[PDB]
Symmetry: C3
Subunit: 169 residues, 3 copies
C-alpha cells in the first residue's frame, strides 16, 4: 500500500461528526434496526474521535486525512502520496543518548523522518522510548513488514497469518 | 438541552448484557446476531474509560455512571432549566501557566441555588471546576454549546459560531 | 463461565488484523451496505487492538487467546482452562506498604503444567499468575469482581459476600424476522 505524508491541520477547515439520525415488512424492521445500529455506533465513533481523530476522519471521508481536535470540533488536512522510494534505516537507537531509542523505524524519503502508523511518513524523528531487552518489533512498511531486533534492522518479513473481526453474510 | 449529572450511588447496580446464543432472512438474522456478539467487546472496552457514554447509549436517556470493579453504578441526569452565563476568560485567576481546558459557566436550579461550574461534553454542565491544562500559544478551541459552538482564541471568548460541515461514518441503506 | 490461564505470547505466532475488502435490487442494497459496514467497522477494531489486543483476538477467533503487540502485528497465545478449585483471599490490602492495594482479588489455584500458583483474578474470568495490579487505597471503597458465574463483593479492601447481579443493561439492537 501507498505512503503518505500528513500536512498539519490549520484552523481553517473545521468540521464535526454527523450527529445521531432520526429513525423512520421484513424490509422495514431491518431498516429501522440498521438505523438504531448506526446511531448507537456513533457513540463508539465519538470516543475514537477524541483520541484518534485522524483515523475517524479517514474512514468517514474515504481518503487519507490528518486530523486534530480543537476542543469539540475537528480540523482536517488532506494527506499526500509519496511516489518515491522509501528507505528504512538500520539502527533505531538515538545517536546522542544511550537507554533511549526511536519507538518506530527511521526512514529517508523524497528528507529525514520516521515510520508512523499505517504507512504514514513523518518528518519529525521524535517518537522515542527507553530501550528494552528482547526488543522485537514488526513494522508495516508499504506492502510488507520489516522486522527489528534489539533496535537493529534484520529483514523484511511477510506475515501471512490473519485474524478477522468481520461478520460473514 | 443542558444537563447536570448527580454522582451515582451504590444503590442500583447493573452490568453489560453478555454475548448471546445465536432463508435469506435467516442468514441475515444470524449475521445480525453475530455482529451484535462481536460489537459487544467494543462496548465492553469503552465502558472502562467512559461508562457514562456507554450507559446513556444503551439506556436512551442521558445518564452518568462509574465502574465499581466490573459492575456499573448509575444515576439519571437532571435536565437544566434556565439561563447560563459563559465566562469570557479561560485563564485560572490563581496562577499563570495554568488555565481551564473547557469554558467556565454559571447557571442555577433545583436543590439548591446558583452553581459556578464548567462546560462538559455533549452539553453537560459540571459543578467541579478542575479541568485544567498549562497555557499554550496560538491556542484555538471550539466548544459545543447548546445547538451551536463557542469560539475561543488564546484563552478568551471571541464569538458564537456554527458548523454546517458534517462528517459521517454512518452507512446508508435505501430500501 | 469457566476459568483461564494465559501463557505469555512469545512471537512464535504473529498475526495481523485482516484488511478491508473491495465491495460488490433490494437484497443487493443490503449486502453492499453490510460490506461497507464491516469495512468502516475495521477502524474501530484497529484502534482497540492497540489497548486490548487480547480481547480483539479472542473475539476474532471465537476462543480465549491472549495477545500483545510487537510493533504493528499481534503475538497470539491460546489460553488454557483451569479446572481445580480456587481459594479467594479476604484482603485486597497489600502486605508490604500501607496505603497501597490490589485492585483485583488475590486467588490461589492449581494448574496441570505448573503446580500451585499464587495469583490474581483478572478480566472475564482470566486467572493471572502475577499479583501486581496495584492501586492506592481509598475510603468509601466498593468493588464487584466477576468470579465464575457470579460476582464477589468487596468493601474497604476485604471480602463480604457472593452477590448475584440480575440487573442488565444492553447496547444490542434487536432484529426480529
Amino acid at each position: 500500500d501507498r505512503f503518505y505524508v500528513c500536512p498539519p491541520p490549520s484552523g481553517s477547515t473545521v468540521v464535526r461528526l454527523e450527529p445521531e439520525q432520526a429513525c423512520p415488512d421484513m424490509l422495514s424492521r431491518i431498516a429501522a434496526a440498521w438505523c438504531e445500529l448506526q446511531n448507537k455506533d456513533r457513540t463508539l465513533w465519538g470516543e475514537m474521535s477524541r483520541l484518534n481523530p485522524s483515523a475517524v476522519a479517514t474512514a468517514a471521508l474515504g481518503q487519507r486525512v490528518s486530523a486534530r481536535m480543537l476542543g469539540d470540533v475537528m480540523a482536517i488536512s488532506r494527506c499526500v502520496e509519496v511516489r518515491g522510494g522509501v528507505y528504512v534505516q538500520n539502527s533505531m537507537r538515538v545517536p546522542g543518548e544511550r537507554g533511549t531509542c526511536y519507538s518506530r523505524p527511521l526512514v529517508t524519503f523524497e528528507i529525514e523522518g520516521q515510520l508512523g502508523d499505517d504507512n504514514e511518513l513523518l518528518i519529525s524523528r521524535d517518537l522515542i522510548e527507553p530501550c528494552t531487552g528482547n526488543h522485537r518489533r514488526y513494522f508495516k512498511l508499504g506492502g510488507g513488514y520489516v522486522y527489528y531486533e534489539d533496535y537493529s534492522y534484520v529483514r523484511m518479513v511477510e506475515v501471512p497469518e490473519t485474524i478477522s473481526t468481520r461478520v460473514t453474510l
